[PDB]
Design a protein around this ligand. Structure first.
Ligand code: CLA
Ligand code: CLA
Ligand code: CLA
Ligand code: CLA
Ligand code: CLA
Ligand code: CLA
Ligand code: CLA
Ligand code: CLA
Ligand SMILES: CC1=C(/C=C/C(C)=C/C=C/C(C)=C/C=C/C=C(C)/C=C/C=C(C)/C=C/C2=C(C)CCCC2(C)C)C(C)(C)CCC1
Ligand SMILES: CC1=C(/C=C/C(C)=C/C=C/C(C)=C\C=C\C=C(C)\C=C\C=C(C)\C=C\C2=C(C)CCCC2(C)C)C(C)(C)CCC1
Ligand code: SF4
Ligand code: SF4
Lengths: 80, 61, 140, 43, 29, 49, 73
């Protein structure tokens, strides 16, 4: 599948979790930021490489990044 | 620094690298980048604010 | 060369002088360009070949329009530069870009004719350029 | 003031650049009716 | 600083630009 | 445009006078620049020493 | 069949199927066999304008194994 790296610069905006359409992302509590939560990607075998999650992240530069890797059936988006 | 201090940016991956910002608010404990800097020109995403560390900035006022 | 004998001597330039096409509705605009083009250099074809060398007998081709252009072209840059210097110290500066502050643009337009006297003044004062530590750059 | 909105409309981007490029093009056209065929300066 | 090593070679190359033009203007033959 | 309007003498034609020279500085008499192996009195033409 | 999605509706109303076209949900527990998980979240957001947040996407393997994959808790 693909590879979703989440760096430590995000603010817990929850805009990337509310944009990944296969629901790869979820918020875990983390005492760093002001909103006290960081995005996490525990289900990256479902990620389709959409990069909706990189489009919705505010921080410059992006705290979330999708590295396009080996493409299985779930990441090609094939109904067949 | 303080609310209204012009600073500069040394983060290379940032869009406003070596540009003049304006500190909007500084937090107290967490995040490691607790300085909100309201820039005047926008990046490609269209926003003009970001968070930066304490040692990241160069005060010019 | 190649065969840049002057146009007044050519059989070809005088053959092109007999079937003149009037440029403007002036009935002798067909004639009052060929006597003017006689001092130029027509090759074997009958057409004046311009000399951009810098020879002073051929200064009318390139030397005279070069001073004439670079005065007008360095004008338009200097007017467009000095306006953008002015609006940056204003309230908004983006409205004054698309929607011209006509009260500020018009003093800058009249100012311009000492732009060589101003650009050399800006050059020697070190206020023409900017510092490389103050311009945004791409990561290497 | 209704008249100020007409000065402020005549100095937007496409309206000023239409008038200024019309005055610019008209100078080159009326210079070329009277003094045509100027390939080079005659010295 | 007055850039001696930069302007030293630029004036050498420009002296080559002026020398070839002297052949073209028949100053030197 | 100038040829299309039937007045082709208003063309902007430039002789390549900086490559006219090199071909005459290599020995072509056809242009009459008279330099540098087309000038038979030249130091380069005779190889003086 | 794979990735069953279930939801409980307060009533019956016409929604839009992710496979193209409009169907009509029942009142009570519903069930829709879709092709991929991408359909179920694109349907699960279409339920949000109907004020329904009780949807569960399964994962029906060809052996008969049904794995509950959304939500985690
Ligand atoms: C304020 C006017 C202005 C000035 C002083 C300059 C100056 C410069 N430009 Mg730039 N440029 C401008 C406007 C201007 N530009 C605009 C509007 C565009 C978009 C079309 C560009 C596109 C552009 C490119 C693509 C390049 C430059 C380059 C350059 C440099 C070399 C000169 C050159 O190649 O001209 C280039 C000129 C043009 C491509 C067209 C000129 C644009 C219009 C015709 C003139 C603008 C007049 C202005 C609107 C008048 C406003 C008056 C005000 C009172 C209202 C120099 C730093 C070159 C560079 O980097 O070299 C190092 C280069 O590659 N510029
Ligand atoms: C994406 C393409 C694009 C577009 C749509 C514009 C649009 C504009 N540019 Mg811009 N620009 C561009 C690319 C572009 N630029 C690029 C690539 C550069 C190089 C960095 C610039 C550099 C630049 C400068 C330096 C200037 C503009 C100006 C302008 C304005 C023209 C107004 C005008 O001519 O008044 C006509 C005015 C008159 C005829 C005077 C009477 C308008 C906002 C000019 C402006 O607004 O001047 C205030 C100006 O000076 N632009
Ligand atoms: C009536 C139709 C009409 C048409 C044909 C245009 C055409 C144009 N507009 Mg436009 N414009 C219009 C109405 C129209 N406008 C209206 C109603 C407004 C709001 C007042 C604008 C505001 C506007 C802005 C702000 C700018 C243009 C610009 C431009 C030019 C694009 C760049 C170019 O070709 O040079 C183009 C000529 C750009 C330009 O620089 O033009 C010179 C530009 O920056 N337009
Ligand atoms: C760009 C501005 C501009 C300028 C400076 C001139 C300048 C001139 N025009 Mg003119 N003209 C222009 C635009 C311009 N024209 C436009 C846009 C039109 C089309 C409506 C005309 C139509 C026009 C006619 C019909 C005549 C002039 C004439 C003249 C000359 C007499 C003085 C005068 O203003 O009248 C003068 C050289 C007159 C002239 O001397 O021609 C014989 C004349 O009869 N003009
Ligand atoms: C970009 C290249 C280029 C260049 C260098 C030229 C250059 C020229 N063209 Mg050409 N032309 C071009 C592109 C170009 N054109 C294009 C793209 C077209 C097709 C649209 C034409 C179509 C065209 C035609 C149909 C004619 C010309 C003419 C001319 C001549 C100008 C005559 C005149 O009175 O001006 C001199 C103008 C002035 C001295 C006025 C300036 C006064 C200033 C404001 C005073 C400043 C005071 C400080 C000149 C040699 C005319 C000509 O005589 O042909 C040889 C002519 O009839 N051209
Ligand atoms: C520093 C400014 C400068 C100056 C004053 C000159 C001056 C000259 N160059 Mg030159 N040149 C320069 C920079 C300069 N160059 C640069 C930076 C380049 C590199 C692109 C060239 C490349 C160059 C070539 C390729 C040619 C000239 C030629 C000429 C001569 C043209 C004939 C004449 O009198 O006009 C003239 C001596 C021409 C010539 O015949 O001179 C040898 C010629 O063919 N130049
Ligand atoms: C960047 C622009 C540029 C480039 C890449 C070239 C490239 C070339 N030119 Mg060319 N040329 C240029 C501009 C340029 N030219 C200009 C502006 C003129 C004056 C009209 C000429 C006149 C010219 C002639 C007469 C000949 C060439 C020839 C050639 C070819 C051989 C190399 C040579 O002689 O260099 C010549 C390079 C220069 C003369 C100048 C180098 C570029 C300068 C630095 C740009 C700035 C010029 C400046 C605007 C002029 C100021 C005007 C002054 C009076 C105020 C080569 C393809 C030859 C050819 O056709 O071979 C078959 C040839 O015989 N060129
Ligand atoms: C594009 C540039 C160019 C090229 C490819 C050549 C190519 C050549 N030149 Mg030449 N030359 C050039 C520019 C050029 N020239 C210029 C700018 C000048 C003026 C300084 C000369 C002056 C010149 C002379 C005086 C001689 C050559 C000679 C030669 C030939 C032998 C070169 C060699 O020994 O190695 C060769 C045909 C030599 C030869 O005998 O061939 C004619 C020779 O004696 N060249
Ligand atoms: C609506 C509008 C608009 C638009 C407009 C337009 C786009 C326009 C165009 C216009 C144009 C495009 C123009 C044109 C011009 C032209 C010209 C400028 C001409 C001139 C001419 C002349 C000058 C002539 C002369 C003569 C005579 C008269 C007789 C015979 C001879 C001769 C030919 C010489 C805008 C955007 C602004 C804004 C909004 C509104
Ligand atoms: C003589 C002659 C010639 C030659 C020439 C040459 C070769 C030259 C060179 C020159 C050079 C090589 C130069 C360079 C330069 C550089 C620089 C560096 C510049 C500067 C500029 C600036 C900086 C700009 C500014 C401005 C202005 C001025 C105006 C407008 C605005 C602006 C800002 C844009 C020829 C043969 C062609 C032809 C014949 C004659
Ligand atoms: S990665 Fe982006 S969307 Fe996720 S918490 Fe950080 S800033 Fe928010
Ligand atoms: S690959 Fe990108 S768009 Fe797709 S689910 Fe993962 S984060 Fe969202």
């Amino acid at each position: 599948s693909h590879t979703v790296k989440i760096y430590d610069t995000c603010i817990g905006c929850t805009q990337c979790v509310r944009a990944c359409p296969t629901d790869v992302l979820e918020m875990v509590p983390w005492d760093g930021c002001k909103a006290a939560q960081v995005a996490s990607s525990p289900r990256t075998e479902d990620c389709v490489g959409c990069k909706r999650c990189e489009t919705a992240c505010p921080t410059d530069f992006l705290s979330i990044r999708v590295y396009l890797g080996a493409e299985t059936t779930r990441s090609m988006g094939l109904a067949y | 620094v303080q609310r209204g201090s012009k600073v500069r940016i040394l983060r290379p991956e940032s869009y406003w690298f070596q540009d003049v910002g304006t500190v909007a608010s500084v937090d107290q404990s967490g995040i490691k980048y607790p300085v909100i800097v309201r820039f005047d020109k926008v990046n490609y995403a269209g926003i003009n604010t970001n968070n930066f560390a304490v040692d990241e900035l160069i005060e010019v006022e | 060369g190649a065969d840049l004998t002057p146009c007044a001597e050519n059989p070809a330039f005088q053959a092109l002088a007999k079937n003149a096409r009037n440029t403007t509705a002036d009935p002798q605009s067909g004639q009052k360009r060929f006597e003017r083009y006689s001092q130029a250099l027509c090759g074997p074809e009958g057409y004046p070949h311009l000399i951009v060398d810098g020879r002073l007998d051929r200064a009318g081709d390139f030397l005279i329009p070069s001073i004439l252009f670079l005065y007008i072209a360095g004008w338009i840059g200097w007017v467009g530069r000095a306006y953008l210097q002015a609006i940056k110290k204003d309230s908004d500066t983006e409205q004054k870009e698309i929607q011209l502050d006509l009260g500020i643009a018009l003093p800058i337009i009249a100012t311009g004719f000492a732009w060589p006297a101003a650009a050399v003044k800006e050059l020697l004062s070190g206020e023409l350029t900017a510092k490389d530590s103050e311009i945004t750059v791409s990561p290497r | 003031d209704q008249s100020s909105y007409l000065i402020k409309f005549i100095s937007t981007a496409p309206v000023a650049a239409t008038i200024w490029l019309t005055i610019t093009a008209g100078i080159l056209i009326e210079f070329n009716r009277f003094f045509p065929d100027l390939l080079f300066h005659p010295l | 600083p007055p850039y001696t090593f930069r302007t030293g070679w630029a004036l050498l190359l420009l002296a080559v630009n002026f020398l070839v033009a002297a052949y073209y203007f028949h100053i030197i033959q | 445009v100038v040829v299309a309007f039937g007045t082709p003498e208003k063309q902007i034609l430039i002789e390549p006078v900086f490559a006219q020279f090199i071909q005459a500085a290599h020995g072509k008499v056809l242009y009459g620049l008279d330099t540098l192996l087309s000038n038979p009195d030249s130091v380069a033409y005779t190889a003086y020493p | 069949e794979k990735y069953a999605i279930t939801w409980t509706s307060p009533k019956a109303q016409v929604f839009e199927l992710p496979t193209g076209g409009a169907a009509t949900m029942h009142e009570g527990e519903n069930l829709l066999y879709i092709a991929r998980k991408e359909y179920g979240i694109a349907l699960g957001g279409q339920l949000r304008k109907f004020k329904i947040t009780n949807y569960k996407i399964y994962r029906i393997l060809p052996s008969g194994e049904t794995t509950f994959i959304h939500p985690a808790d």
